[PDB]
Amino acid sequence: GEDGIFLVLLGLLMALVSWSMDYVSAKSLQAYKWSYAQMQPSLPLQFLVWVTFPLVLILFSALFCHLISPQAVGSGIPEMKTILRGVVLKEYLTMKAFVAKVVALTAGLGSGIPVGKEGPFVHIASICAAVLSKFMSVFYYSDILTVGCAVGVGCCFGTPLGGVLFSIEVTSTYFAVRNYWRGFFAATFSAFVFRVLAVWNKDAVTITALFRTNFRMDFPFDLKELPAFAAIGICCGLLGAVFVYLHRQVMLGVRKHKALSQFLAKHRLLYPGIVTFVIASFTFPPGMGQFMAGELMPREAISTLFDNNTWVKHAGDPESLGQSAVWIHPRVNVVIIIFLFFVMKFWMSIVATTMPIPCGGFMPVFVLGAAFGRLVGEIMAMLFPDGILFDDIIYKILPGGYAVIGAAALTGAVSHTVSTAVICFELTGQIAHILPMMVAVILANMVAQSLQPSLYDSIIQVKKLPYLGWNQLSKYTIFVEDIMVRDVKFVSASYTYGELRTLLQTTTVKTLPLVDSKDSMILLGSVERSELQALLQRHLCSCCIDQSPFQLVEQTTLHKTHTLFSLLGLHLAYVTSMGKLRGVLALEELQKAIEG
Amino acid sequence: GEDGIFLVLLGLLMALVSWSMDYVSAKSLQAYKWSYAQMQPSLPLQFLVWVTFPLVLILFSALFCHLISPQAVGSGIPEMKTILRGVVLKEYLTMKAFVAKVVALTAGLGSGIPVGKEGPFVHIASICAAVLSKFMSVFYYSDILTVGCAVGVGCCFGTPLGGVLFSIEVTSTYFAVRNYWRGFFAATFSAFVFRVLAVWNKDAVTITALFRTNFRMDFPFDLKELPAFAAIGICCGLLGAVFVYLHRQVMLGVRKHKALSQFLAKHRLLYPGIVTFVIASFTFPPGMGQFMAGELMPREAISTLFDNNTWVKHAGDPESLGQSAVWIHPRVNVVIIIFLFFVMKFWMSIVATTMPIPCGGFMPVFVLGAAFGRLVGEIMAMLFPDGILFDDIIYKILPGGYAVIGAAALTGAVSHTVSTAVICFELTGQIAHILPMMVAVILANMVAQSLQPSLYDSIIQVKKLPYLGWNQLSKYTIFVEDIMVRDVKFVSASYTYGELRTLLQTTTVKTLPLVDSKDSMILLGSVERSELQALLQRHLCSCCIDQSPFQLVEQTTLHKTHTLFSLLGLHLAYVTSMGKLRGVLALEELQKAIEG
Secondary structure, eight states: OOHHHHHHHHHHHHHHHHHHHHHHHHHHHHHHHHHHHHHOOOTTHHHHHHHHHHHHHHHHHHHIIIIIOSSOTTOSHHHHHHHHTTOOOGGGGOHHHHHHHHHHHHHHHHSSSOOOOHHHHHHHHHHHHHHHHHHSSOOOHHHHHHHHHHHHHHHHSSOHHHHHHHHHSSSOSOOOHHHHHHHHHHHHHHHHHHHHHHHHSSOOOSOOOSOOOOOOOSSOSOSSSHHHHHHHHHHHHHHHHHHHHHHHHHHHHHSSOHHHHHHHHHOOSHHHHHHHHHHHTTTOIIIIITTTOOOOOHHHHHHHHTOSSOTTTTTSOOOOOSGGGGGOOSSSOHHHHHHHHHHHHHHHHHHHHHSSOOOOSSHHHHHHHHHHHHHHHHHHHHHSSSOEEETTEEEOOOTHHHHHHHHHHHHHHHHTSSHHHHHHHHHHSOOTTHHHHHHHHHHHHHHHHHHOOOHHHHHHHHTTOOOSOOOOOOOSSOOTTSSOOOOOOOOOSSSOHHHHHHHHHHOOOSEEEEESOTTTOBEEEEEEHHHHHHHHHHHHOOOOOEEOOOOOOTTOOHHHHHHHHHHHTOOOEEEEETTEEEEEEOHHHHHHHHTO | OOHHHHHHHHHHHHHHHHHHHHHHHHHHHHHHHHHHHHHOOOTTHHHHHHHHHHHHHHHHHHHIIIIIOSSOTTOSHHHHHHHHTTOOOGGGGOHHHHHHHHHHHHHHHHSSSOOOOHHHHHHHHHHHHHHHHHHSSOOOHHHHHHHHHHHHHHHHSSOHHHHHHHHHSSSOSOOOHHHHHHHHHHHHHHHHHHHHHHHHSSOOOSOOOSOOOOOOOSSOSOSSSHHHHHHHHHHHHHHHHHHHHHHHHHHHHHSSOHHHHHHHHHOOSHHHHHHHHHHHTTTOIIIIITTTOOOOOHHHHHHHHTOSSOTTTTTSOOOOOSGGGGGOOSSSOHHHHHHHHHHHHHHHHHHHHHSSOOOOSSHHHHHHHHHHHHHHHHHHHHHSSSOEEETTEEEOOOTHHHHHHHHHHHHHHHHTSSHHHHHHHHHHSOOTTHHHHHHHHHHHHHHHHHHOOOHHHHHHHHTTOOOSOOOOOOOSSOOTTSSOOOOOOOOOSSSOHHHHHHHHHHOOOSEEEEESOTTTOBEEEEEEHHHHHHHHHHHHOOOOOEEOOOOOOTTOOHHHHHHHHHHHTOOOEEEEETTEEEEEEOHHHHHHHHTO
């Protein structure tokens, strides 16, 4: 209701901020291409500007990463999926950090270097959600965490139901549908605002999602090349494994050597920019875009890449098409230019996400999948150059569907989900090839499930955050008798002023275990420290007893122990026998155990 | 993996059965229209056949409802959502019943009378799921229930993600995403099989969902009639309330009078058919389709209803269009013919679902919403007959989007969900007007949430099944001390043969509470009866002790009590103090309490 109005103000602010970032991004970027062209074409000096623009943007981004952000380097979703798995970091929910990240993401988004977008944007959206939740509704915790994740991604791209499905469908175990309904309303009106502000101010036409891909939708598929999609299962799954292996091969390479650590404490800013420099050394278009078309910044790159005609036959014409004119070298076959383009993007994208940046994990993967798709579509167009006939309708084949299905497939492979296909077609604007793209997506997903772990789980693995569960453990003999902590704090009401002051001076935690007597040992409840503080001071100048909801039977199986703490989403365990409290089991202590 | 292969065999069988039912349905239906036409047009005798065909189909359906089905009358989803809420009915999971329902549903689907499809089909799909789960995987319970619901609806219409979202998003509280992944793979390959079998055998073209609705997708909306959608919020919500009130007005009318009860035991078959007769008395086309076009069986009715041109201007032509030629009376304005058509469908649809039939709750609602949509689209076309201009593109307006958004809206209003819009556009084949249809859907959903309860919740309310929870109860003083049952069964190991035989002869339940001694009263575990039976007989001719997972603190708040039994999905409670077992709280006993 009016918590929906709370949420709609949230989406209103985020859409104003997104309009700001891509507005200034597009203006700066076209100003780059504008001044770059319009000074003069001299191959030493255009080389000079071709070096000096990415490095100055990376200097702004890396300075803002270093100096202003004390902890927000390498930000994204896996820390907050660790937060909803339990590890709360309220200091990492600092208001000062939000503005400290986002414009650097603008530097990342306004850059022609491949960055992600969504991940840390989801993170700061949930940050802003939590802070305005502190500010509004005075003007339930992991509920707010989960809804913040949902509102963040569905409010990112105006794609509501893929946002909320991507928030729930992996980054949880169970989920309450009330919050589904709430955050879905938030995501839908937030989706609404993103396009209409583009119409009240400076205009897109009416209602593209972003990418109207005008296909014929008349005899679309057909049913003869579908087993070729089987290849786009298996091969894609093949390549999918390679990223995680090499990501591990670089994350260890992040932290293997003491030399660069010493030099990082000595001088941190130099290393990213220079290797930015050297990948810029492979980007200059009359230098190297003669064979790759590297002067394709990714948004218009994928828009020209979803061109619904065969480029081998349009290699037959010198026609000024749209931006796809960049896809012609006059001597080299374009399968080769796509081949080298993708492989250089392969080793460029991992180094791009390597350096210390808040990185979303989706768009360069989308470009790479779409690249592989139009690759195989153009070569199957080469394999059957004819295409087909039918009854007063000559229908020859077309490669655009291959591009959009691969751009679904590979990010499904990275992300271990199904929501990539929904956001894929929800941004595509047509949903023709939906069942073949879903089958190939699930083929690659189960190959990935077979071979390699998740992206973000490997990320928190290298960052070493303790899982936060672990499941499917059939122990021979494992019992929590060697495990429980026998440290118990205790307060009595018949303790008077001095005893209760001593208990204040000995204890630190927010709420406290109550038993009757330490000899009886039986757990009774939990009490706030500060209420006792209140009673002492404001009597010197209403005794309510709340109940303990849980108890650990001391031979609980490790499957069910994991399951109980998972589905409660709770921290601690008071372990009794016969009611008499015997031990304390902590969440992190269970993780340190269940490491094996 | 291979449980996916288990599931893919499930979807394979269901798609063969669906092809069978709509194949024979379409052949019988066109054979009806064929012989009906081709005998002769004499207005007494075509009246004779116009009576005698629906009544003979209803005789087959009602005889199969009465004689063969002992319990499957009035079947659907709310009994199985009551099952996953707890009320297990294994006898209602009888194999003999599955074939006992489905062909009658064929009689329902092959009928020109409005029936639903999905509900009891989901029910029998989960029936077949459970029985083959008994048969396969020798060749975890509510997991199988939930996945059976998901596989059933996503395997119904080839619309996987709307199926699994409609299975989870209301008909649960929490849900495990592993089963999401499993059933989603099942639903997607099941979706795949439904269309390709139509291509290996007798053909649709390639890959319609069902309904390719060829819109221009070029300046689609625009942004001027969108506040008219506000009306399609509020008015739709208005009408939404009316169904539940009148549904209650007829379900009480189902069971208010002893006269028809006596006559039902006397002779049950006569009543439905005759009122079928009298609604047939309003259907005969040169009788009454002169003003309504009642000779529109619903599938082709909605296909002709999504015609992308203005029928008021095409009231200007005598053109042989497609089936929309039926939309012309030569003297009466077509807004009037749509007006009377809808209102007669209003009082026809409730009587259609009234009589004792396994009824899905979606398609006649879809027709009615689509009717109201093309109504308001044609009258706004009448309000602005001009439509608009733009830069070398004359774009006049079109009513088809209004039809598809209302066919989303009203079934969202009935079903209290958001999944109606996904299955709406997933069968529509284009997703142009997606954000306006989602906003209007959520507008009507919150109006419905404000005013009237759910459909199926009102259904089980009238059928009086005990909820199975109830939430948001802030008690003054309610405590389970007046509540717990002090009947305890007990077995000891040091009981020998005669004592354990007496315990067999006194007890009946599947597993049993173990304490140490009845004087100690402390609950220890639970033991199978039959294992004791085994020990007695196969020693006459390995003692393992399993643990009790739960204990009820005797002052537990009613919110949290409801919450604990809800999220466990479990039946009983052993209520102890100091470990010593004191009482037993049952699920149905809690429901009998929480009635207030």
